[PDB]
């Protein structure tokens, strides 16, 4: 309850500078699980307009509108593009109520008065109360605007939903001694409770409306044109298409390399092979596997998980250091004798991600981590299980694999270790599209974490529904 | 080893307290002849917000002698400001009776010698006690109503560090802190000092704390006793 | 625990007779020695014409306080009291003590019968004053210091004349004005600017830190603090910053409030419980 | 459900543990008070696996 | 009181143990519990030392402990003595901090000093005699202030923004020595301290007079000096006859403002435990008045 009140006052004190109106939300088991509710660290929200443009960026356009680079030296913009993305998200206050409750009884047991149009109870295993701001860029609010909600957890993992302002305001705008603001806020109470879905109808959350909000006083205008909603839908379409266009880029690359080579696949992975085998049925199984990979590829494909560490801020500088290191001049005798010893080069083992596609019972594994190293005798690759065990799927006739190396080289491997090899091309995606869709979250400091970086943080914060809360 | 002082008090104040032990407080008046008036914790139990209706009625029913009536009158005069008028003297030793009473208080050390507290006024943050217990007298102001209502307490805690004690006292008295800031909002023309104040009394042993009654005028009022109290008076130090 | 003081100057019948009137009074000396010279005796060594009261109040804090207890000859014997024991002390300040007062030491403001002068040097002893009078004298001096830039107006002249006058039980006297020749001494000036600077820095920084801490736990106290800030800004309405500069503002706030610790706090030195009828002397319990 | 389970047994409302400071200043709690009478000796409380 | 405390050792002490434990006579060692008989594990700070939890946690445990002065060691017994208020004792500084005469001394957990050796003492098994630092007040409230400012500044900042600022804040220079504050985590206790800071600052901003607010602007119109230049510069990037003249309003506001300022000061100021008046010219011991 107090988070809504404080956030209302906070958005009022900031309204002239920001023009963000305070939207009060409640989340339950329809949007997040109990562990995610108890261990939630941050909530972040983003405003994008009827043209797909975030309100943290330049109002007319950005240098991120140019296509990506494919260079590790550039890393799709480097630190500046990362900073332009981080500036686009804004942080929201939130409180978790981790034990089962019924919402209206909770509000009445607090100071509030509730006078809903129909007294329908809603019951919820846990509740997260948070306030997001949707930006009326003037005293005018459009229905084609969408708002993004981000929930983040201590390991840095995040979950994004997005819903457009028309869903939120479908009803609310379509109808449009001395006292303390706290007492009249409680006395005036709540009279609305509306259920809103995100655009893709994945998650439901409830919006809570108060009659004491400064929202009521402003008498600003709202509108939804058809063409604006059409353009907003097109921008949304471009948003969600970003991983699938990369998947199709890899698919077209595989077919293009296969046409270029003439179907001759050289061995790149170690596996003892026999001549006296029906290699043609292996080619047929390769066809079925390459169809099935397109059937089941997803956002959690190896290609997205390979590009994601490239978008991190350190990536460009580290790539330039590596470029300098590999092309360093051979040391003179003086340096070897008197000077410092040379930097150790890249470790013999690399970390990769793979998509393992088995045909016999159609199944595709996507976010698979493997360790790769070249065996000394022949420079082929040995792919090992991240517990150090040799991966056996090279020996199974009914499985093909697509690996993507950390430098965005991809292999597509058949039984026997004969592979198609090429590079993932990012040029079909604007730098902003990739960069905003897949940039990793970087944490701001909070309760229970070291001021110094790199420290082993102590017991992570939690709000417990199973235990009597400590103070 | 103990240091004692002699004080003279009128019968009206003594009427409930004449028992051989008590905590004595000097209270200030905006006048010339009776500048200072020697008061016990029982009398403040009348003005306290924490004392129950039965006990408040008992103490009012006793303290009808004119001296106590004037004492309470001067107690209520200047709000937000109780503790500024009070300076605390030692615990009381055996008394000499008369229309003018003479009672000697020990201001330091120790040489039965118990400290008597009413049941309502005694509070303990910790439900288990350390072998050495430190005693405090604390006053907390509630700003919810038009007039300030004081809550008077005598606390025993294992904490002697002041910052830790004030942290836990803020943790307990959060509602009064919010009342203080709310009072600053809703009555801007009035300027309070602080949320509450703490004064240090001496130290006692955890197994020497006992609960009993102390009869005067044939009225059974319930009392907590610190059996072998030792006196170390500090300053009224304010916390918000 | 006796400290010997010796006079590097020719004493006389009237000097020793004047000095024997003070045979229980409080004399501060700069640091603990076994044998000191009379120049270190009293507050005279610290007096100058540029710093004044606040500087003396700071300096008097970390002197060692002593009681005079004999004059054997050309030498004076001083006894340094220990915490908790009961001692006889002379009242020579501007007021009278009642039983159970908490007594404070202030640099003196009035000065004839006491003054032992020899060779441009004279014995100057602090005031022993009950705690409320010390607090009120202090606040009155500070407020007179803040009125120091607008003495051009007749109402402020009257207000300073009202601040100068203080009445306390059966006594009345005027606190001297900290403004001399229209100008405020250097240490009172820096005390006043420290108070004003801490006020301004608080008013500038509080909103940002309230937001930052409310992002962690939005307790009701933070609600009321934010409301109070918004009200304050409405009152001001009648008419981004770098990390280095934020750290500079925070550090400046804290270093400015370190400047005030002498003014805001007030040590009790003696607790009085026995008084002579004369009000000339009392026996007190020592706090140190 | 918690209060129903409390009532079915004879158990009492939950309690916070000692703070690290308070557990450093104090050496125990002993939340089971002595019974009104003790005819047999000390209670040999059975632990159930 | 328990004027003397017997500390018994379970490990048999070698010749070297008894020697080095004898040289430590008059050192200030803390005990958690204040009991007549204790075991050697309870002696010192080693029971609590834990570098994953922060410096503020160990500070909170230490400020609540009972402090003693070491006396003659005998066979497996160490004989700790509790000082009493107002009396005069000889105290030992195992810390690297310098003491000048007249200093007021506080107790704090040890800091990181350059050489990194730090002289481990009495490593019996895997117990160790971790003594606190007896630090003079200026350095004590300097470390408390820097620690609070790190907590207050670095909230809601990322590690990239934080890094250089907190590197600069961790290092303290005091009397030509250089120390570093070990583990400044954002604790629950530190957040309580920060909340108290915010409330006290709100009350300062609200209840300050107009005189207390506007003195600096008027002095800047009147006066010019380096001090005033610095004060103006602190206000710069955010940067008349009184309409009310009220000595009673001024007195009310100022007596309240001093309260709020004391609240804000207690976040920085520690409890003085010793006051020195004699320093050995080798700075290895002092004569002190015990305070509490």
Tab-separated table of C-alpha atoms in Angstrom, chain A residues 44 86 91 313 442-459 471, chain E residues 51-53 150 154-162 166 170 181-186 188 191:
chain	number	residue	atom	x	y	z
A	44	UNK	CA	12.254	-1.665	-14.437
A	86	UNK	CA	20.766	1.374	-20.169
A	91	UNK	CA	13.560	1.789	-12.105
A	313	UNK	CA	30.035	-3.426	-22.383
A	442	UNK	CA	23.803	-4.757	-15.267
A	443	UNK	CA	22.988	-4.349	-11.594
A	444	UNK	CA	22.892	-1.150	-9.560
A	445	UNK	CA	23.881	-1.504	-5.915
A	446	UNK	CA	21.234	-2.461	-3.360
A	447	UNK	CA	20.843	-4.087	0.053
A	448	UNK	CA	23.282	-6.807	1.004
A	449	UNK	CA	25.946	-6.465	-1.687
A	450	UNK	CA	29.557	-5.351	-1.596
A	451	UNK	CA	30.558	-1.871	-2.678
A	452	UNK	CA	33.737	-3.398	-4.129
A	453	UNK	CA	33.301	-5.298	-7.375
A	454	UNK	CA	34.087	-8.972	-7.814
A	455	UNK	CA	33.412	-9.884	-4.196
A	456	UNK	CA	31.609	-13.067	-3.235
A	457	UNK	CA	28.341	-11.533	-2.101
A	458	UNK	CA	26.952	-12.951	1.164
A	459	UNK	CA	23.536	-14.583	1.630
A	471	UNK	CA	13.768	-7.348	12.359
E	51	UNK	CA	35.214	-10.766	5.539
E	52	UNK	CA	32.200	-11.719	3.431
E	53	UNK	CA	29.999	-9.828	5.859
E	150	UNK	CA	29.964	5.370	0.459
E	154	UNK	CA	26.744	4.254	-4.139
E	155	UNK	CA	23.075	3.270	-3.819
E	156	UNK	CA	21.390	2.821	-7.209
E	157	UNK	CA	24.729	3.330	-8.966
E	158	UNK	CA	26.317	0.621	-11.081
E	159	UNK	CA	29.787	-0.737	-10.386
E	160	UNK	CA	31.290	1.277	-13.249
E	161	UNK	CA	30.074	4.573	-11.805
E	162	UNK	CA	30.882	3.460	-8.250
E	166	UNK	CA	34.682	4.339	-3.680
E	170	UNK	CA	38.230	3.892	1.036
E	181	UNK	CA	38.769	0.353	4.948
E	182	UNK	CA	38.430	-3.413	4.346
E	183	UNK	CA	34.855	-4.406	3.374
E	184	UNK	CA	32.281	-1.624	3.032
E	185	UNK	CA	29.187	-3.665	2.191
E	186	UNK	CA	25.690	-2.167	2.043
E	188	UNK	CA	20.972	-3.684	6.842
E	191	UNK	CA	20.649	1.251	5.580
